[PDB]
Symmetry: C3
Subunit: 161 residues, 3 copies
């Protein structure tokens, strides 16, 4: 079977005005709060990993890396992504292309998108043209608009090698 | 045209502490409330049906099965899915693969995912490897995090027969 | 590379009981409020444009048409869509198919869907069978259910010409 589709969706709640600031798409972004989570809280990498595992019918991140397991407290999401991708390659698939939509009232994602694409293209061993990332606001509506957290949605295509 | 993409999204509000407990992905899940709806309220099957009808440019579930029509009060969502799939086959398409993301603060979906995949693979007459299901929390943010309802998002690929 | 996937997501907040009523999918829909936005606020066309640009790894609408730029105040979203599609064709891709899910408590989208599909098929120079549009409610949950805005989600497939 030639191609497979995958979808990922992930949310994190902000901490308080201590938090050690954002990592999104492997990029450290300046901000007054960070996202609370078992690992580094990288919403964009989580959504992307799930899209990949989902396309491969491998479940999701929780399947591969139990949230219960203390070996992943503060785990680097880029490492989790690379491991999942390794498994996807093992199963005979490689990335066709990926598209990510970050949903956050703030901070601005646009300055960091090029580096995010760099990190992803590295991690998924492909050309940067196979990675798209956008960011969008929720016009101050709902919990993202209220600034209580950031959500991220990802969509992916795997090609059979 | 070789392949077609489809997306589905569906939400249901919980009832009170009577409700007759969850059906999700055709699986009856133990819980203090059920989801109010015209049919059985199976959010995951609704999202999946819409993804399929959407890929086929057949509209959505409301198009095929009027919500107004009393013949579908408490309708089995698996039956609705099978009917839609019948129509998709009629139009010359079959499932490539499906991926589903349930968004619910509770109860835990993970124990039921294998059976959900069984029901879907049966319904869409395919191998279980063409079905992925994940569940995710919203970290207690928004109406799902607040426990007022469950949302579900589905993505699908149809292949031309 | 044969096919590319894209995802779009967009939200707009309603104005007050002046607002000059809805445009969605290029269709003017009767309503007591309109959606506030820099351009015409057409959530469905925005989500679709982003899905297209995202599949093409061209970023999103903000990339092509700065929100800062006064040349796009009240810009027609259909025009923005046509420009983006022009760029996608330039890059060697054409629409495979598109699917859109409008998320709105009200007004009813169903009466307008056929015209929306007409506008899109015109804009993306394809057959209406390559366009699907659905609408869904959020059962009065969250900010859409509360009627403070409308959200829209789009998914797309590009084929290499
Ligand atoms: N956290 C965020 C959110 C948005 N953006 C940028 O702002 C643009 C869109 O933001 P938004 O206010 O959500 O735009 P629209 O909803 O499309 O506004 P309009 O109705 O005027 O088209 C995006 O392309 C993105 O580059 C960003 O950098 N960081
Ligand atoms: N109703 C739910 C919600 C979640 N899960 C399980 O819990 C995992 C993820 O839950 P969540 O708390 O949403 O995880 P993350 O947001 O990814 O947490 P982290 O930041 O620590 O990675 C999933 O893989 C799923 O198996 C579940 O069984 N039932
Ligand atoms: N703003 C809206 C929202 C919904 N609809 C129509 O109503 C149907 C579904 O609405 P909804 O109440 O969201 O349906 P379900 O959630 O699927 O209800 P049920 O549980 O009974 O299946 C759709 O197919 C659509 O045609 C509409 O015209 N305009
Ligand atoms: Cl909310
Ligand atoms: Mg984490
Ligand atoms: Mg129902
Ligand atoms: Mg606008
Ligand atoms: Mg909400």
């Amino acid at each position: 079977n030639a191609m497979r589709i995958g979808h990922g969706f992930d949310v994190h709640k902000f901490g308080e005005n201590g938090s050690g600031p954002l990592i999104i798409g492997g990029v450290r972004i300046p901000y007054e709060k960070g996202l609370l989570a078992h690992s580094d809280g990288d919403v964009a990498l989580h959504a992307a990993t799930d899209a990949l595992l989902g396309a491969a019918a491998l479940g999701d991140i929780g399947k591969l890396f139990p949230d219960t397991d203390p070996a992943f407290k503060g785990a680097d999401s880029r490492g989790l992504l690379r491991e999942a991708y390794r498994r996807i390659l093992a199963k005979g698939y490689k990335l066709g292309n990926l598209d990510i939509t970050i949903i956050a009232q703030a901070p601005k994602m646009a300055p960091h998108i090029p580096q995010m694409r760099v990190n992803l293209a590295e991690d998924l061993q492909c050309h940067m043209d196979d990675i798209n990332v956008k960011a969008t606001t929720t016009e101050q509506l709902g919990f993202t608009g209220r600034g209580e957290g950031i959500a991220c949605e990802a969509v992916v295509l795997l090609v059979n090698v």
